[PDB]
Amino acid sequence: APAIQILNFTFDKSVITNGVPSVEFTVTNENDLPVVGLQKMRFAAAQLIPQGATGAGNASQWQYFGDETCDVAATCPGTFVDQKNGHYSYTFNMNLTANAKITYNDQLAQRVLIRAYNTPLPDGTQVPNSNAFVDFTADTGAAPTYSRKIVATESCNTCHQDLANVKHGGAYSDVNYCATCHTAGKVGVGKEFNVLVHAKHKDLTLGSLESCQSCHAANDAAPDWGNWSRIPTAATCGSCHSTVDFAAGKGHSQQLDNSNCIACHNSDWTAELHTGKTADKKAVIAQLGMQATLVGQTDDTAVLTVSILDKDGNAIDAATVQDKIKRLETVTNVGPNFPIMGYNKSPGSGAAKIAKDLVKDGALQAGVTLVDGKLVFTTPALPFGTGDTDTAFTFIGLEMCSTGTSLTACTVDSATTSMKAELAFGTKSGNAPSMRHVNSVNFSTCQGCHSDTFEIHKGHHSGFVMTEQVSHAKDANGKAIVGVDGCVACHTPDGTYASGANKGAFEMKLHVIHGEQGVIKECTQCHNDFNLDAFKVKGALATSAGKYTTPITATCTSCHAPESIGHGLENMGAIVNGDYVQANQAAQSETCFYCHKPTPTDHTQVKM
Amino acid sequence: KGADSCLMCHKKMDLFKGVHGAIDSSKSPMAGLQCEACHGPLGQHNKEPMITFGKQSTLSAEKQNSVCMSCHQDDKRVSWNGSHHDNADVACASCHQVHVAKDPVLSKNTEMEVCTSCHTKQKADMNKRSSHPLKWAQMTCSDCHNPHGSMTDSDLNKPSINETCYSCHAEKRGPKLWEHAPVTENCVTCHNPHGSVNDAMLKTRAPQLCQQCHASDGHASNAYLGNTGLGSNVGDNAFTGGRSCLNCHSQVHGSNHPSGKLLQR
Amino acid sequence: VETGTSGTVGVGVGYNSEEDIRSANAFGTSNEVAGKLDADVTFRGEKGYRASVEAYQLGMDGGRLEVNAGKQGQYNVNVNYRQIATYNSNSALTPYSGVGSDNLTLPDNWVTAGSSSQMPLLMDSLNSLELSLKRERTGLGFDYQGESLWSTHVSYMREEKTGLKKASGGFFNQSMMLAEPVDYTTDSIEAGIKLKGDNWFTALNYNGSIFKNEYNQLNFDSAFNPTFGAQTSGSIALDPDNQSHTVSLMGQYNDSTNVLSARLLTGQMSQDQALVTSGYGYQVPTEALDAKVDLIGLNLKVVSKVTNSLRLSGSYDYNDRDNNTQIEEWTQVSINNVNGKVAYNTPYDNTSQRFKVAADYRITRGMKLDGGYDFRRDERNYQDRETTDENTVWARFRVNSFETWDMWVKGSYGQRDGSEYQASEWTSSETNSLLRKYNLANRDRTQVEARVTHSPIESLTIDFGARYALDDYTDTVIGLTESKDTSYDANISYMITDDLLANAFYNYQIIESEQAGSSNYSTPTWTGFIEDKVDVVGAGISYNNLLENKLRMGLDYTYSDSNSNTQVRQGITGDYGDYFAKVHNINLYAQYQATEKMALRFDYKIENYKDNDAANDIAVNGIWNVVGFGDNSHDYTAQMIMLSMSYKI
C-alpha cells in the first residue's frame, strides 16, 4: 500500500565496452529497502569536453549522444535486467562510435542519466518520477578528473520549490539533467544552459536575482560552482548583456573569440561588480535600528516616541542623524486583529488611519519634538474601545540618504536606502496589548524570492525592510518570527485609497498580486499553516468601491472569480458585495469550513 | 758564462721564432738562465733530483707546472692552484706549446677545437638551434671563461654570472625602475649559456616558462592545451601562438616606464 | 727574416647563393660576394723594438686585427678591432614605416580595425625587414712593465652595435610586432697596478662600463581601433643609458706548503635616464630617476698540502648587491580602474655567500680521489622566500694507470631548503598558495658523470662518457616539479699511420621537464611535459701530404637535430606542433703550396637547413588581436665557395 515516495540510486559499475555503454545499479526507497519490479526507464549517455579543448578561454561543454526508453512490458532497444533484489543493469543498443554528430572519445569523462518514469510496479505500487546520473571514466569506471557541476537544484528550489514544475511536463527535477541535455548541438543556439537560464531571469524584478549567489553559491553538490567568475565568455555574459555584439565591436571592443576576456575580466573584478550593490545595501541597512513606544492617554490620544538605535541597538541622539533622514514615516491604526480605522474614513468608526511623517528632507515636521534625544508626536484622538480596539498600533518606516556604504546628509539628487522597519503597540487602559497572529505566514518564505533586503514600497514611500526588529513571537524551534502584521495599518478591511476597488485589505492583497505570477504554484510558498480560527474575529471586507463581503468568501474570491463557484455563495449565509451593515451582520454566518478542510499542502480538500 | 752549447748537440725542428725564443727582455733567455729555466743544467742530462731532464709534455711527469708558475702568476692565473684543471692533473703544456712561433691556443679560430677535445658536451650545445656564435668562430670560451680558473663558480672571467653577461649585454644591466626579479638575480634562471633547442637559449620557452613562476588566478594560471583535435590550434591564440605571453608582456627583462610594473611598455 | 719585417699576408673572395639571410652566419658576410684580408707580420732590430700586426678574416664577420709596438720588456701599446654579426631573418613583414627609426608610422591612408583579419590595408602595406645585429669593437691599450715588481695596465674599447630586435607594443590585448632599433655604443675601461714578488703579488684593478643607447623610447601608431583608454599611439621605454664602476684589490701569497688568495671588490652601478611621459596621462613623481646599486665582494681561498698523499682546500665568497634606489608611488594603467592603480617600485637587493672545503688524496700515481662539501646561502628582497640555503656534497675518482684506459667519475648530491614560503604582497594579484618558484624552492639536485678513453693501438683512441642530472623539487605542488638531464657521447679517432687522419662523433641529450598548475587557483588541475632533445653526429677526414708540393686537404660532415615537444594535460592532452631545426653542414677544403713564397687554398661548404615553429607558422593576420611578423620557417640549401692566397713578405 505505502506508495513509494523516494527512489535513491547507487551506481556500482558504469562503463563503455567497444562503444556500447553499460550501467549496473541499486534502487532503494525512503527507508532504505530495495525497490523491485521497475517497469519503465529512459537512459541517456553523454560526454564532457574539458575547459579549453575547444579553444583558449572557452568553457567545458557536454556532448549528448542520445536516449533510449526501455519498457519491460513493451519495446526496449537495449538489455534491461532485474536481479529482483534491488539491483539492476542496463546495456544500451546504441554504439557511441556510430554517432553521426559526435566522435565518441574514450578519454573524455562520461556521464549516464536515468529518468525513472511514474509507472507503477506489477504489484500495483506507485513509483515517483525520479532522476539519477553517474560520472565515470569510459574504460575503468572510476571517478573522473574533471566535471561541470556549477549550480545546484537546492538553489532553484528556493523559489521554484521543485524544478519539475518549470518545464517539460515534470519529466526532469535535477538541474544536472537539464544542464546535460541543453548543450551545443542538442538544442538550438541560444538555448544552451549557460545562456538560456540567465536569459529567462534577466528581466525579472525579484530582489534575490540581483546577486549571482541566488544561483551560484558554494554547495557540496557543485565542486565547480566558482566558474561563475572565472569563465567569462561572449555567450554567457552576453546572455544578460544582450546589447553587446562582440564580433562586430558594438558596445565593447571587438572580441572574435574568448581567448582574451579572462585577461581583462579577472575573477575578482567580475565578482565585486556583480555582488557589490547588494553588499553595499546590507552594509547601510545594518547601521541604524529603531525602537518605538506608544502610550494611550485618557483623552483618547496616543503619545508615540521613536528612538533611533546604533549598530548594537543602543539609542542615539537623533539630531546626530536628523540631517540624513529623507523620510521617517508613521502609520497608526486601532485593532490589530481587525483594524477599525480605514485608509479613508471607515463606515463604522468614521475614522481614518493616522498618517504622519516625523521627518521629511532632514527637517522635523509640525508637532514633532526632540526629548532625551528621541522623537515625540501625539496623535489626534483615536476610536479606542473594548477588547481588541483597546490596542492602538503603529508601523514605522525609515528612508536614509546614502552613498555606497555611507549615510550622507540628504541633498536634492541623493540616493536613499530603506532601513529596518519597526512595529509598536500601546493601550488606553494600560493593560497588556492585543496582537495579531504571525503563525500562518512567516516573512522568511518571502526572502527566498525577494531577498533579505526587500525594500517594500520604496519609491512613493519610505520603504519597509522587515526584520526581527518587528518580531513579537517565536516558533516551534524557538526562533523569532517576522510577520507581515504591520502592513494592516494601511491595508485595512476598508481597502486603501480606492476603498475596495483594488481589494486593498491585506487578507486579499498578496493573494491577488501573486495568483497572477506563474512562479507561485502552492500555498506552502508563504503558508506554514492556515489560521482559520482568525476569521472568528474578522468583519466584512471591502471587495469593490464601497461594498463589502463576508471574510472567508472575500479571501477565496481573491483568486476565484465569484461567478465560477458552481455551488453559489449567498446560499451559505454569505453576502458578496453587499452594503456594510448587511455584510458585517453576516460576517460569522459563513458555512464554508463545515465542508472545506484546507491545508497549505492541499487547499482543495473537503469533508461532506 | 752563458752555456751557449746545449743548442749545437741538438738538431739545428723547434724553431724559436716565438715569444720564449726572443732575446731582448730580462725574462726567458737573456739576463736569465736560458734552456736552464725550463729544463735545468746544474750538470746537464747525459750525466732525477737536481738534474737536467725536464720532459715538459702530455707524456712523463705531472704537476710539472711548478716551473712555469715561478714565472707567470699574474692576475689571471690566480685560483689556478685549486683549479678544476690543476686538480684534474691538467698541465700548462697540454694546452700551450712554446717550441713553435705563435701558439695555436691563442688563435681564436681554434681555442674551441682544443677545449672541446675533453668538453664534449659543448660540442653538442653549440650545434643546437640557438646559441652563441662559436661554431664559425665569431666567439669562443675565452670570452666567458678563464681556463686557469676564477674565484667564480664555473670559472667565469667576471666576478659573478650577471656581470660576466653584462660585459656584452650592457643594455640589460640595471638598475631599471621595474625589474623582473629572476633577471637581476641570475641570468641562467631562464637561459642556457651554451645553447638550447629553444630560441634565445631558454631552458623552457613561451607560456610554460612563465607558468613555472606565475600562478595567479586567471589567464596566467590556465591550461593552454594547444593543438587538441577538438578545436584549439596552437597558433590561433596569443597565449601559445606568436610570442606567447610576450605579445602583451614584451619587456621580460624589466621596464623603466612609469607604468611598466606588469612589463607591458 | 729574424731581423727586420717578416711574415705573411693574404687575401680572399667568396660567393654565396641564395638570399635567405641565415646562410650569412656560415658565410663570412651577408653580401653576395665576400671580401677577406688575412695578415701576420713582425718587425724587430732597434735595441729590442718589436712591432707585430696580425689580422684574421678582416673584411667580414669574425674579423679581427691587433697591432702592437714598443720595447719587448719595458712597454707595449696595442690597438685592436673585432667584428661580430649574427643574422636572424629577412622574411618578416611589417606595415610600419620608419623601420630602424625612433618612430614607426602607418600610412596616412591607413584604416584601423578591431583585428588584423579585418584591417583593409594590412596586406597591401607590408614591406620586408631584416632582423640582424652587428658589433664593431675598436680598442686601444698601454702596458708599461717596470724593472722589478710593478707593472701597469690601461685599456679602452668602444663597441658600436646596430640592427633590429623583435618587440611587442600594444594597449591591453591588442598587440603589434615592432622592429625595435638597436644603436648601442658601450665603452669599457680597464686600469691596473700589479706588484709582483718571488712568491707573492698584489693587484689593484679598476673596471668601468658605460652603455649609451641612441634612442630612449619607441613610438608607434596603433593598427587597431582605439580600445578602452582611447589611445592611437604607444611609447615603449627602451633600455636606458647606464654605467657601472668597480675596483678590486687582489692578493696572492705563494709557498711550497700553503697558498692564500684574496680578492676585495667595491662598485656602483648607476642609471639617471629621464622617464617616458609620451602616451602616459598621469603625473610622474620625478622627471628622472637616480638609481644606484652598490656592489661589494670578498673572495678567500687557502690550498695547503697536509702531506703529499692529500691536499686540503677551503674557500669563502661573498657578493652583496644593495639597490638603494628611492621608492615612490607610480600610477599604473588599469583596465579595472580609470584613474590608475598605484604601485610602489621594489628595488631588489641580492646577497650571496658561499663556503666550501675539499680534499684531493692521491692513493697512487695514476689514481686520484677528490671529495668536497659546498654550502651556499642567498638572501633576497620583496619575494616569496627571504633566504635559501643549499648543502651539496660531491666526489670525483680518476684512474689512468691500468692498460691504455683512462677513466674518471664524479657524483654530487645537493639539498636546497630555506625560510618560510609565503607569497609577496607586492604583486597585483596574489599567486596560488601552493606555487613554488623553482629558484627559491626546496630542491634535491643529484648528478653523476662518467668518462672513459681507451687507446690500445697507437694511431687510434676512443672516448665515451655519460651524464645524468636530476633537479627534483620535492615540496613543489604548483610550479616546476622536476627536470632531468641525460647525455651520452662517443668520439673516435684513427689512422693506419697512413698520414691521413679520421674522426667521428655522436652526442645525444634529453632534458625532460615536468610542471603542474591550477585553473581554479587551488590544487593542481593540469600538468605540462616538455622534452628538449638533441642528436648531433659528424665525421671528418684530413690528409697532410708531406715531402711533396706541400698540399693538405680535408672533408668534414656534421648533422644536427634539435627538437622540442611540449604537452599539456587537463582532462585531455594537447600538444604544440613541430618545433625543430635539422641541419647538414659539409665543409671541403684544400690548400696547395704553389710557388714556395705563396700558398693558395680553396673552401667549399654546403648547408641544408630547415626549421619550423608551429606557433609562428601563421600569417600576419594569423591571430586576430595581434599584428605579427609572419612565417619564420626556413628551408634552404646554401652553396658557398671561397679562394685564398698568402704571400711571404
Ligand code: HEC
Ligand atoms: C533533453 C534530455 C532535455 C532536458 C533534460 C531538458 N530540456 Fe529543456 N529543451 C530541450 C529541447 C530540445 C528544447 C527545444 C529548444 C531547441 O530549439 O532545441 C528545450 C526547450 C526548453 C526551453 C524553452 C526553449 C525555447 O526555445 O525558448 C526551456 C526554458 C527549457 N527547455 C528548460 C529546461 C529545464 C528547466 C530543464 C530541466 C529542469 C530542461 N529544460 C531539461 C531538451 C531538454
Ligand code: HEC
Ligand atoms: C539562476 C537564475 C542564475 C542566475 C541568477 C545566475 N546564473 Fe549564471 N549560470 C546559471 C546556470 C543554470 C548555468 C549553467 C550551469 C551548467 O551546468 O551548464 C550558469 C552558468 C554561468 C556561467 C558559465 C560557467 C561555465 O561555463 O563554466 C557564468 C560565467 C555565469 N553563470 C555567470 C553568472 C553571473 C556573473 C551571475 C550573476 C550576475 C549569474 N551567472 C547569475 C544560472 C544562474
Ligand code: HEC
Ligand atoms: C501605507 C502606509 C501602506 C503600508 C504601510 C503598506 N502598504 Fe502596500 N500598498 C499601499 C497602497 C496605497 C497600495 C496601492 C493600492 C493597492 O491597494 O494596491 C499598496 C499596494 C500593495 C501591493 C500591490 C502591488 C503593487 O502595486 O506594488 C502589495 C503586494 C502590497 N501593497 C503589499 C504590502 C506589504 C507586504 C506591506 C507591509 C509588509 C504593505 N503593503 C504596507 C499602502 C501601504
Ligand code: HEC
Ligand atoms: C504569499 C506569496 C501568499 C501565498 C502564495 C498565499 N497566501 Fe494566503 N495569505 C498571505 C498573507 C500575507 C495573509 C494574511 C495574514 C494576516 O495577518 O492577515 C494570508 C492569509 C490567508 C488566509 C487567512 C488565514 C490566515 O492564516 O490568516 C487564508 C485562508 C489563505 N491565505 C489562503 C491561501 C491559499 C489557499 C493559498 C494558496 C492556494 C494562499 N493563501 C497562498 C499570503 C499568501
Ligand code: HEC
Ligand atoms: C748530445 C751530446 C746532447 C747534448 C749536449 C744535449 N742533448 Fe738533449 N738529447 C740528446 C739526444 C740524442 C736526445 C734524444 C733522446 C731520444 O730518446 O731520442 C735528447 C733529448 C732531449 C730532450 C727530450 C727528452 C725526451 O722527450 O726524450 C730534452 C728536453 C733535452 N734533450 C734537453 C737538453 C738540454 C736542456 C741540453 C743542454 C742544457 C741538452 N739537451 C743537451 C742529446 C743531447
Ligand code: HEC
Ligand atoms: C687550457 C686547458 C689552458 C691551460 C691548462 C693553461 N692555459 Fe694558459 N691560456 C689558455 C687560453 C685559452 C688563453 C687565451 C687568453 C684568454 O683570454 O684567456 C691563455 C692565455 C695564457 C697567457 C697569456 C695572458 C693571459 O691570458 O693571462 C699566459 C701567460 C698563460 N696562459 C699561461 C699559462 C700557465 C702558466 C698555465 C698552467 C699553470 C696555463 N697557461 C695553462 C689556455 C690554457
Ligand code: HEC
Ligand atoms: C626569464 C625569466 C629570463 C631571464 C632571467 C633572462 N631572460 Fe633573457 N630572454 C628571456 C626571454 C623569454 C627571451 C625571448 C625574447 C624574444 O623576443 O623572444 C629572452 C631573450 C634574450 C636575449 C635576446 C633578445 C633580448 O631581448 O635581448 C638576450 C640578448 C637575453 N635574453 C639576455 C639576457 C640576459 C643578459 C639576462 C640576465 C643578465 C637574461 N636574458 C635573463 C627571458 C629571460
Ligand code: HEC
Ligand atoms: C593579451 C592578449 C595578453 C596576453 C597574451 C597575456 N596577458 Fe598577462 N595581462 C594582460 C592584461 C590586459 C593584464 C591586466 C592589465 C591590467 O591593467 O590589469 C595582464 C596581467 C597579467 C598579470 C598581472 C595580473 C595577474 O593575473 O596577476 C600577470 C602576472 C600576467 N598578465 C601574466 C601573463 C602570463 C604569465 C601570460 C602568458 C602565460 C600572459 N600574461 C599573457 C594581457 C595579456
Ligand code: HEC
Ligand atoms: C546575469 C543577469 C548577468 C550576466 C550573466 C553577467 N552580468 Fe554583468 N552585469 C549584470 C547586471 C545586472 C549589471 C549591472 C550591475 C550594476 O551596475 O549594478 C552588470 C554589470 C556589469 C558590468 C558593469 C559595467 C557597467 O554596466 O557599468 C560589467 C563589466 C559586467 N557586468 C561584466 C560582466 C561579465 C564580464 C560577465 C560574464 C562573466 C557578466 N557581466 C555576466 C548582469 C549579468
Ligand code: HEC
Ligand atoms: C580588454 C580590456 C577586454 C577584454 C579583452 C574584454 N573586455 Fe569586456 N570589458 C572591458 C572593459 C574595460 C569594459 C567596461 C567596464 C565598465 O564600463 O566599467 C568591459 C565591459 C564588458 C561588459 C559590460 C557591458 C556593458 O558595458 O554594459 C561585458 C559583458 C564584457 N565586457 C564582456 C567581455 C567578454 C565576454 C569578453 C571576451 C569574450 C571581454 N569582455 C573581453 C575590457 C575587456
Ligand code: HEC
Ligand atoms: C720555456 C717554456 C722553454 C725553453 C726556454 C726551452 N724549452 Fe724545450 N720544452 C719546453 C716545452 C713546453 C716542451 C714541450 C711542448 C713544446 O714542445 O712546445 C719542450 C720540449 C723540448 C723538446 C722535445 C721535442 C720537441 O720540441 O718537439 C726538445 C728537443 C727541447 N725541449 C729542447 C730544448 C732546447 C735545446 C732548448 C734551448 C735551446 C729549449 N728546449 C728551451 C719548454 C722550453
Ligand code: HEC
Ligand atoms: C622564475 C622565478 C620566474 C619566471 C620563470 C618568470 N617570472 Fe615573472 N616574476 C618572477 C618574480 C619573482 C616576480 C615578482 C613578483 C612575484 O614575486 O611573483 C615576477 C613578476 C612578473 C610580472 C609583474 C606582475 C606583478 O607585479 O604582479 C610580470 C608581468 C611577469 N613577471 C611576467 C613573466 C613572464 C611573461 C614570464 C615568462 C616569459 C615570467 N614572468 C617568468 C619570477 C619569474
Ligand SMILES: [Ca+2]
Ligand atoms: Ca521592536
Ligand SMILES: [Ca+2]
Ligand atoms: Ca482598495
Ligand SMILES: [Ca+2]
Ligand atoms: Ca641616450
Ligand SMILES: [Ca+2]
Ligand atoms: Ca636596499
